[PDB]
Design a protein around this ligand. Sequence first.
Ligand SMILES: [Mg+2]
Ligand SMILES: [Zn+2]
Ligand SMILES: [Zn+2]
Lengths: 49, 50, 75, 58, 1336, 98
Amino acid sequence: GQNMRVAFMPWNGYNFEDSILVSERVVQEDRFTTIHIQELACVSRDTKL
Amino acid sequence: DIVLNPLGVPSRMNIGQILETHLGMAAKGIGDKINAMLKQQQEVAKLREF
Amino acid sequence: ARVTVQDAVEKIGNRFDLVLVAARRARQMQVGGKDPLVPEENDKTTVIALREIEEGLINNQILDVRERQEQQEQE
Amino acid sequence: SQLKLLVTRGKEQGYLTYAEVNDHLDADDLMLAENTADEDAAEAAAQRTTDPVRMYMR
Amino acid sequence: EFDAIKIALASPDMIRSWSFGEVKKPETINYRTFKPERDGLFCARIFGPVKDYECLCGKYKRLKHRGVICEKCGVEVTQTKVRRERMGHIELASPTAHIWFLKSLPSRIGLLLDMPLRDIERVLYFESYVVIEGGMTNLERQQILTEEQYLDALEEFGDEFDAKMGAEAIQALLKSMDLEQECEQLREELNETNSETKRKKLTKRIKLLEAFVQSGNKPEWMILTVLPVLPPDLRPLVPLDGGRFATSDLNDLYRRVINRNNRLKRLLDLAAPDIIVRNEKRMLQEAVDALLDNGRRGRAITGSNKRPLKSLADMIKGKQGRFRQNLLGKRVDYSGRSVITVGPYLRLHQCGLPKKMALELFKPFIYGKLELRGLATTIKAAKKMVEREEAVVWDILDEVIREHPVLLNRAPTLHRLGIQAFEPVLIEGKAIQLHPLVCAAYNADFDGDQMAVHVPLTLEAQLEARALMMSTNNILSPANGEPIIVPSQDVVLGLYYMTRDCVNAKGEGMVLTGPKEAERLYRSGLASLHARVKVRITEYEKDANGELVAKTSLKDTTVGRAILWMIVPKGLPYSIVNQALGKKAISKMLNTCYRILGLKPTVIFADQIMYTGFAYAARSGASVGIDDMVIPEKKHEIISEAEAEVAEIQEQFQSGLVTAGERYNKVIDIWAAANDRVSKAMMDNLQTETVINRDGQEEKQVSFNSIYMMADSGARGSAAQIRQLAGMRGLMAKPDGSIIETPITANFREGLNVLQYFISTHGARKGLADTALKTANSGYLTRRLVDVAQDLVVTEDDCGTHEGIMMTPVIEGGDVKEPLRDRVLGRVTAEDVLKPGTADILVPRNTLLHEQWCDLLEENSVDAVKVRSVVSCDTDFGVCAHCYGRDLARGHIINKGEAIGVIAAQSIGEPGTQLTSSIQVKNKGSIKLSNVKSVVNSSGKLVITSRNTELKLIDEFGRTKESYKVPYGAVLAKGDGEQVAGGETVANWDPHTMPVITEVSGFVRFTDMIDGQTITRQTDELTGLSSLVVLDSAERTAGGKDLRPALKIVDAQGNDVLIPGTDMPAQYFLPGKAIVQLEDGVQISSGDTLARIPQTGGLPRVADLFEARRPKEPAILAEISGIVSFGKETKGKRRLVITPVDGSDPYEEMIPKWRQLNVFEGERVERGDVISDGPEAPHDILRLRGVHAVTRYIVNEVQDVYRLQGVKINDKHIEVIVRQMLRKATIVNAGSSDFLEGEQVEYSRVKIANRELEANGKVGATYSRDLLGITKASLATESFISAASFQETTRVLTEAAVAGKRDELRGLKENVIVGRLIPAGTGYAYHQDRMRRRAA
Amino acid sequence: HARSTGSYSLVTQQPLGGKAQFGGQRFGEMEVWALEAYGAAYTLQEMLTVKSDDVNGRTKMYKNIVDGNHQMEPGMPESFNVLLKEIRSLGINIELED
Ligand SMILES: [Mg+2]
Ligand SMILES: [Zn+2]
Ligand SMILES: [Zn+2]
């Protein structure tokens, strides 16, 4: 994971039950950006026609 | 960076996260002190001593 | 609008008959072709029907009487 | 007789084990087990191999 | 369209009528061209063309010529969907028995023929012959004749002899059988001599013959001659990607049946030996059996995958059948799901919907709007526009969404608040924003949960969502009246911190002009949020017929309360916000607002409360650190002292002074005391702090510690969690349930070592497993509860009945744990509530008791009302609104049509997962004795002479406050009619040995007492006294066994002393094992002891209490009022006979001698009294005591389970289930009706049957009510479509078919399956109109 | 995951399942109980027939919606027809009396 600077306080109901309030500079610095690779296949068959 | 709710700690008695937070604060403080000494171009003697 | 429906229920009396009457009036005003008895603030036909029911301008008896009169006119 | 004792035990406990039913008693065994579960009444309480191949052999 | 469904048996003619052709070959399709074969299972001639409007060859391949049968192929030119509707048939070479009517538990075939099932099976498998109408040749019909016996019987009989084998014999038997004549014969038999079971069996036989005659069926239809074939498209052979195929298991079974049938037909032409044809017919029977039901008679036929094939029966039954998997719940269009987030800016009636999800769900609406507004020409242009997501598309989407509710749902839908309608607000992102206040209704947290969203389509659906399911309509729980929109954890902390005074804060002592100045001072930094000031407050009161008169005065408050007063609506007082405002104060505030003002002000108030709480919780900056967990300074001393004490106990045990079973308890108690001391020290240190000061002196105040603030406000936590955080973790258990002696002496601030953590793991694993099991059980209970009581609906306004339950507060010995207000609020009085002074009527009648009436009753201090109840309603097929009460979720009297059974079931089942001597008075009142006979003992005090004495503490206000039970013969310091003070022990008794005592004083003589026949010689060596111990009947000799020890009372004059007030002689037949101490001729004082006679919980308690199970040892009640007597003894169990005063005494019971009886044979008892002692039975109470007593036993015995866990539900919901439990009546006297004597009939039917009959010139029939369980009472459904849904499908369809049953859809579970409006809610009017026109 | 309309299963004409197949949401028995607790008979009916397996009622509903008319002709679901045919494929004769 990543080492995040955290504070324990309510702050306006945006962390109400188990929600998390995240800064916009954690997104500017691409700290939790992940790369996902997926495969797609296109099979051509010999049909009746 | 992140704001968490303290009301989550008492009921779920996992106070290891508070101790982790305190120790991470201490570790980052040591790191920031080293960084300050490194930016100011201080000789290796004081860096080594600290 | 109409965050609550409590005056209309008092006017009609029953919570289910209210739904049935409002649906009848809304279908009259949507597909049948009719003009609302109250000003519309961009309201959907269901909400306009609800507020008409609330103000006492519509109920089951009113609708039946009006349909009878209309059928007499068509005849 | 033997079935009556097993039925009494099952009624007292409301349930029975495979060993208890088998002792107190392939297709005939399965049929008897199915009959026993009927109560969980009169017809089951009062109540060859059914294999088409065994009858052919006989 | 149809309005009813009928089921019966199918004739061969009927089966040939359904079919469009016969399947002759087992072929399916060509392996090369993939076209359907001819006369095969997939045939175009029989089942229709494979593609729309096109013959198989292709000569006719256009719509223009439709309905023509191509000559080359014979395939009709129609739609291909017709392959989904056409059946075929197979004409079996030889008859086959139907397995459902052979291997059913009653064995319909055997029952009808009156033959054992084994005989039928052996004749079927070609084992022995059967004679069919043999004739006058010395043969008996239905006689087993093995091959040898048949062969030797054929000789010497030139007659045909009429013997056959196999299913043909059974068919001939059934066809020859005549039902009317046999019914007449059975009538003749029933007329003559009757035996215990002979009459019962003959009655059953005649009744079932009558039923089969009246159903219209014929017996021989149980033997198959033609077999229907399912349409091909319901058993498809479908190509998968590649050269592979997928097929249903029915194709294999049909192929086997057809192969064996064709082989048999071929074989019957070769004139094969009978062995071969017999084997072939056995195989054909086996194959048809496997087809109809596989794995029921023999071994299940398997396929290539070595799994049992699915048969026709397997496609109907089970949790994966058409009845359950697809008819009661299925996948739906216009739906989505996604993860939920907070969105705290919302209003209670709206939610946040992603733009992408909203665009996908509302696509047709957007197409319609685009075409209507002219942006797009055709629907294709609209499709392309929405696919490119142009700019106009989003404005159109915003217009479509304007006022269109969407239903949000969370997967475990435990009650009806798990679905609610909100108004969307389009947002960015991919998560749904859910209003905080509704989370508790869903039980939803934001740690990864997901929600499903559905969109109503029709105008009626939109109006129902807006008027019935909106979130601003459901703010009260339906189980009780309490709000379910209470702020939860962070709002509570914010409002607690805001309204929480401090001793010496900035700006203390100021005098403000109002809330506005308080906020202006706080916000500009001149005052603290808790500074004690004086503020001029103006509050309004409805001290009139709704006028809101104002009052202005200088209150003494803090800045926080003055600021919080700005959001409170007009009608409320200022004392609601003038306190600390914990978790429960806020709920009380919302409840007060709702009751005083209404619905809209409450919703606005709740939103303002949420906003203010969030804002000021953020403002406070409350956090949690490691210094907030203050460990006591004396913990080590306490632990060391406990260690010393336990070590001393252990070393004392090592010296052999105490048994281990006692030292264990001593150590447990030592550690428990130490834990309590540590917790007390911690809480004392953690809940207070010293501050200074107005002048400079130390002053205590409640702590501002963060952990303490979170626990005290109810936001989160408790005293147990704080105890584990800063005290000691406590005392752990073991897998065996034992409690390990040495506790965990460490908290979590300190660390646990490896062993303590190992024990903690022991606990945690079990916790998780138990949670899973509880969730498993609580769903089954709810399902049964819904099944039993689903069709109950309010269907009347007033039945006019004058009866009901008697509501009084519940008292468990000492204090009262449920006042009268809780049990009476919202009900309808059944009789005038006379003032306790008996002056005038306080509440006339039929008045819904709302809050004002309850306050009036409390003011006048009445403690007993008569409230109408559901279990005593006169309505037929439903309940009336007056006998139910009020909705509990809307606040007014319940509406007609509302489905109360489902609500009751859901309310009872929803909290299932949560749930797991001497008498001392306590108040200064007056003693009141009820049901006791008094007398003065030798000491001059008063001694109880009764078994059911009740002591009540009537205070000066005339209200009961303490109810106590006193056993027989207890010395009383005070009595009735004398004022007493507190702390006076008004009664005491010996809780040992036996209470056997006398009633008079005088000389005692051992009348009818012979040594060596009834007593043994055992002199008291310790005291030197001679005591005659009465032996038992077994040990004693027969010389005087029938005699009993009687101790008559006499005087010194030689006369006889009799019972005062009566001439009955004073004798006491003492029982066996009685130690006679006093010798004959020794005067005894009154009440002397003649003989010193020696001696679940949680969910399963609720589940076994709705099933009306009988306890292990049910206490015996008095069957009939009369003098108790005894008969023949030791006949397995002791015999007792009760003789009424005048009435006959046909009652005699084999009471086991083991039970310790509490009544003597010379003591009369009325019916309903206890003879033995132990748990009561639910069935005995109903029989001995009316319906109002069994319901009272239940609604109080299951409410105890819920009260322990803090769950509260209304009593309305338990009396709804009970009403469905005792629903069948057993008839005792037929009377002038048409009812059999020993028959069980619906209580609704019998009630109306004799009611109209009595009005005429006839006499009604008596009966006795019966009580069933929720599982046995749900099997009496009168529709075979709702019954097959949750019962055994095979049993229900087999019995309904022979009976020729037809059901008219009248329930809620049947119109869902059929797919029409339920008769409960908005569809109630539709059904009533249908019945009205149908009657015409 | 969101769905308006898509592909339907073969033997029983219900929306397919799963996000990969663009499937619908399963509306189980507990949700039916919840809608019965309210008097929402029309919502329940439209979820049972038009939205799931009423083959010729759902196309009519779609056409009505794209025509600015929110009214349904409910009809009879396909699962009940399949059930009738399966019960009838045995020896039983289950019919719909008018
Ligand atoms: Mg969760
Ligand atoms: Zn052709
Ligand atoms: Zn009633």
